[PDB]
């Protein structure tokens, strides 16, 4: 079927027609076609797409912000990359290029003439105006007026020149396309080169695209954030910011995303930089950056889990919003808001609400159906914090979140001051059934806390993967229960959840978690991958529930790494590995706040509460480990370990890394995109 590509002005349209013609000549008559829709600005394109008049357009990431808002509701679907195919970069540097010997530094921009790629764009507008606008004198609104009065003349393509004449002074009419000579990276650079402006806000590659001679480039330099200047090839140490790459956008909820990828992937295969055919994707005799940037080297599909907000990233989204609404944030660490806890489905949501009531406004609740969904919400600001198994502390880390406190399990000296080395991942088997002794584990039945968890998955599958050297655990074992697995997998066959709950990584799946995995072993499995205290915790009437009330510790043993099968209590000499304690994670901007609030909360409702029936206890939940593990003694300080690498530690990081291939996690791929 055909993708209607939105071209802005006649030069993009000419390249678009050649694109179309060359694709017809090269792909089967059944594959992807491209058609061309002409519009007068990227914004006309966004609206055309939202209205089903076109399907695709490439946007600078700042402009992706505009496209994602209602009523447009567009989303990134295919991203440009730069650098090379051998080293794909999905980001670039915003720089400020000036002429050598103009004198002024970044903090001396007032009264200079500025050249911008376009209003609302990353390098050309959001980054540099973001750096200046909070020092601008009242009235700050509208932003354009303040910017107009700051510089003594600008070219800001797509600005309203009738309202703000000074913003088009260097480019009358602020034309929002390449028919305006000063439009875009190369137009803004030309604005500086001609001597119209004194500064051009563009990307790190712009000058190299426009001046091939080093001797010519020597007449320019960059403005660094520390109010010094450096040569134009030193952009790595002299840039204003790093920003996400330009990306093709399409309608959310039905925008032909696979057709667009199929078209572009086949396109980069025939007309990419490595194929000097009659048609090139990434250049044109009719101008630069037409349809895609000349600096792009190819396309990468955006991960399905990665929505527009995650594509831009928390920091940049927040900066944009504040820029548009003209607001200058008065520090998150000064206000310190209530903590929005993310509860895993309704079981946790109910406990969290009780907590919310008892915290009298310190704690608020949000819910999601999986740990990944919750982490994504913390990333984007819908929630603030949650406690995570080390396997997801790892993923959260890759997603840019940091650990703030650790659950501790060892009573009780000064628990908050005493960091623990970690609990133990063990392999539990039923005594006298029979020669189940590692090695011949193939074809057996396995129980896991959930896909992606330390003791339940990463540790054993890690060790398992070393042997078999393929990623198909679902056919190493004959079947099992591993919540979070593909619903058709044999590793879902043993799960107990009803209807659509089957194999869900939450408590609606009865086998999810430490206790659930033990129940799986007792009822269905041959081996349960759990923590070392699970068997003691769920035997001898410790678990009052009917399935466990009459179980006892003597009937279970541990699988040793050497084939031995010591009893449960000898975990210290018979474990698969050490597991770093679960930890609370949050965003950097809220870490101090969450830290303080959580310490006072556990002082109110921690493991020093009595009753637990009348009173609310933060670290009890029957047997379900709601919000925190039930054997949590307190939340403890991390000290130097406020980073996922530093916290989890070298051994476990490499052990998880060793399982990078095999990973099924859609959030991991999303967070690992740049
Ligand atoms: Fe850009
Ligand atoms: Fe765990």
Is 582 annotated as contributing to ligand binding?
yes
Ligand 1 centroid–CA 215 distance in Å is 27
Give the number of C-alpha atoms closer than 13 A to the C-alpha of residue 414, restricted to the C-beta side.
Answer: 3
Q: In 10 A of CB 517, how many CB atoms? A: 31
CB 67 within 8 A of CB 59: yes
Q: How is 467-489 classified by DSSP, letter by letter?
A: HH-SS-HHHHSSEEE-TTS-TTS
Token representation of residue 342? 């993310």
What residues contact 439, with CB distance under 8 A and at least 6 apart?
563
Is 124 annotated as contributing to ligand binding?
yes
Q: Measured between alpha carbons, how far is 652 from 391 in angstroms, rounded to an integer? A: 9
Q: Measured between alpha carbons, how far is 152 from 115 in angstroms, rounded to an integer? A: 11
Reference 447, options 539, 512, 537; nearest CA is 512
Q: Measured between alpha carbons, how far is 604 from 361 in angstroms, rounded to an integer? A: 14
What residues contact 200, with CB distance under 8 A and at least 6 apart?
96, 97, 98, 114, 115, 188, 189, 191, 192, 206
Q: Measured between alpha carbons, how far is 598 from 652 in angstroms, rounded to an integer? A: 26
Q: Measured between alpha carbons, how far is 362 from 604 in angstroms, rounded to an integer? A: 12
**Beta strands at 220-223 and 91-99: parallel, antiparallel or unpaired:** antiparallel
Is 60 annotated as contributing to ligand binding?
yes
Alpha-carbon dihedral 119, 120, 124, 126, rounded to 10 degrees: 140
Which segments of 573-626 does DSSP mark as H helices, in order? 591-605
CB 409 within 8 A of CB 423: yes
Is 123 annotated as contributing to ligand binding?
yes
Q: In 10 A of CB 309, how many CB atoms? A: 19
Q: Which residues pair with 473 in a beta bridge?
A: none
Q: In 10 A of CB 500, how many CB atoms? A: 9
Q: How is 495-538 classified by DSSP, letter by letter?
A: ----GGGTT-SSTTSTT-HHHHHHHHHHHT-SEEEEETTHHHHT
Q: Which residues pair with 35 in a beta bridge?
A: 4
Task: Give the experimental resolution in Å.
Answer: 2.1
Ligand 2 centroid–CA 527 distance in Å is 17
Is 121 annotated as contributing to ligand binding?
yes
DSSP assigned state of 123: I
Ligand 1 centroid–CA 216 distance in Å is 24
Is 220 annotated as contributing to ligand binding?
no
Ligand 1 centroid–CA 121 distance in Å is 6
Token representation of residue 470? 């393929």
Secondary structure (3-state) at 633: coil
Token representation of residue 644? 């996922």
Reference 586, options 382, 313, 450, 309; nearest CA is 382
For 39, 390, 398, the CA distances from 672, given in Å and listed in that order, are 35, 18, 7
The number of the ligand nearest the C-alpha atom of 293 reads 1
Is 251 annotated as contributing to ligand binding?
no
Q: Which residues pair with 229 in a beta bridge?
A: 223
Secondary structure (3-state) at 156: coil
* Neighbour-count burial for 415-428, b at 16+ CB within 10 Å, e otherwise: bbeebeebbbbbbb
The number of the ligand nearest the C-alpha atom of 124 reads 1
Question: Which residue bears the tokens 């991991």?
Answer: 668
Domains in the chain, please, with CATH?
1-91+244-333 (3.40.190.10), 92-243 (3.40.190.10), 334-422+580-674 (3.40.190.10), 423-579 (3.40.190.10)
Report the number of secondary-structure helices (H) and strands (E) in the chain.
23, 26
Residues with CB under 5 A from ligand 2 (ion): 389, 454
**Beta strands at 57-59 and 247-251: parallel, antiparallel or unpaired:** antiparallel
How was this entry determined?
X-ray
Reference 672, options 248, 261, 88, 240; nearest CA is 88
Q: How is 184-215 classified by DSSP, letter by letter?
A: HHHHHHHHHHTTS-SEEEEETTHHHHH---HH
* Neighbour-count burial for 604-621, b at 16+ CB within 10 Å, e otherwise: ebbbebeeeeeebbbbbb
Residue 72 CA from chain centroid, whole number: 23
Q: Which residues pair with 80 in a beta bridge?
A: 299
The number of the ligand nearest the C-alpha atom of 184 reads 1
Ligand 1 centroid–CA 598 distance in Å is 40
Q: Measured between alpha carbons, how far is 519 from 497 in angstroms, rounded to an integer? A: 13
Reference 439, options 482, 459, 468; nearest CA is 468
Reference 120, options 46, 15, 179; nearest CA is 46
Question: Which residue bears the tokens 């969290």?
Answer: 352
């Amino acid at each position: 079927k055909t993708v209607r590509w939105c071209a802005v002005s006649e030069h993009e349209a000419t390249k678009c027609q050649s694109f179309r013609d060359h694709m017809k000549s090269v792909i089967p008559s059944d594959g992807p076609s491209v058609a061309c829709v002409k519009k007068a600005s990227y914004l006309d394109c966004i609206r055309a797409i939202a209205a089903n008049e076109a399907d695709a357009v490439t946007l600078d990431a700042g402009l992706v912000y505009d496209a994602y808002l209602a009523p447009n509701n567009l989303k990134p679907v295919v991203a440009e990359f730069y650098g090379s195919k051998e080293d794909p970069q999905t980001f670039y540097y915003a720089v400020a290029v000036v002429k050598k010997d103009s004198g002024f530094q970044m903090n001396q921009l007032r009264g200079k003439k500025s050249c911008h790629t376009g209003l609302g764009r990353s390098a050309g507008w959001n980054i540099p105006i973001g750096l200046l606008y909070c020092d601008l004198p009242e009235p700050r609104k509208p932003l354009e007026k303040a910017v107009a009065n700051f510089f003594s003349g600008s070219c800001a393509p797509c600005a309203d020149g009738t309202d703000f004449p000074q913003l088009c002074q260097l480019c009358p009419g602020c034309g929002c396309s390449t028919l305006n000579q000063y439009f875009g990276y190369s137009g803004a650079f030309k604005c500086l080169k001609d001597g119209a402006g004194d500064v051009a806000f563009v990307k790190h590659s712009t000058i190299f695209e426009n001046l091939a001679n080093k001797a010519d480039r020597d007449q320019y330099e960059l403005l660094c954030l520390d109010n010094t200047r450096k040569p134009v090839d030193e952009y790595k140490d002299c840039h204003l910011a790093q920003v996400p790459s330009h990306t093709v956008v399409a309608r959310s909820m039905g925008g032909k995303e696979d057709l667009i990828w199929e078209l572009l992937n086949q396109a980069q295969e025939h007309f990419g930089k490595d194929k000097s055919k009659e048609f090139q994707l990434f250049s044109s005799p009719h101008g630069k950056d037409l349809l895609f940037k000349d600096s792009a080297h190819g396309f990468l599909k955006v991960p399905p889990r990665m929505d527009a907000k995650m594509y831009l990233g928390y920091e940049y989204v927040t900066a944009i919003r504040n820029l548009r609404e003209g607001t200058c944030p008065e520090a998150p660490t000064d206000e310190c808001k209530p903590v929005k806890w993310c509860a895993l489905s309704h079981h946790e949501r109910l406990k969290c609400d009780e907590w919310s009531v008892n915290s009298v406004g310190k704690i608020e609740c949000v819910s999601a159906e999986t740990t990944e969904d919750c982490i994504a919400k913390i990333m984007n600001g819908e929630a603030d914090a949650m406690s995570l198994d080390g396997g997801f502390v790892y993923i959260a880390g890759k997603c840019g979140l940091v650990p703030v406190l650790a659950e501790n399990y060892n009573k009780s000296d000064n628990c908050e001051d005493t960091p623990e080395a970690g609990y133990f991942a063990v392999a539990v088997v039923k005594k006298s059934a029979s020669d189940l002794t590692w090695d011949n584990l193939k074809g057996k039945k396995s129980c896991h806390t959930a896909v992606g968890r330390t003791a339940g998955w990463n540790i054993p599958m890690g060790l398992l993967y070393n042997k078999i050297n393929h990623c198909r655990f679902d056919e190493f074992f004959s079947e099992g229960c591993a919540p979070g697995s593909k619903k058709d997998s044999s590793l879902c066959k043993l799960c107990m959840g009803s209807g659509l709950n089957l194999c869900e990584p939450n408590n609606k799946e009865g086998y999810y978690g430490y206790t659930g995995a033990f129940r799986c072993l007792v009822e269905k499995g041959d081996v349960a991958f759990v923590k070392h205290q699970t068997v003691p915790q769920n035997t001898g009437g410790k678990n009052p529930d009917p399935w466990a009330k009459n179980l006892n510790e003597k009937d279970y043993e541990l699988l040793c790494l050497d084939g031995t099968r010591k009893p449960v209590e000898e975990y210290a000499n018979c474990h698969l590995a050490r597991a770093p304690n679960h930890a609370v994670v949050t965003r950097k901007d809220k870490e101090a706040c969450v830290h303080k609030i959580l310490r006072q909360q556990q002082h109110l409702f921690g493991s020093n509460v009595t009753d637990c029936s009348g009173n609310f206890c933060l670290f009890r939940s029957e047997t379900k480990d709601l919000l925190f593990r039930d054997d949590t003694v307190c939340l403890a300080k991390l000290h130097d370990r406020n980073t996922y690498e530093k916290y989890l530690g070298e051994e476990y990081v490499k052990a998880v890394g060793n399982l990078r291939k095999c990973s099924t996690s859609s959030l991991l791929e999303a967070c690992t995109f740049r």
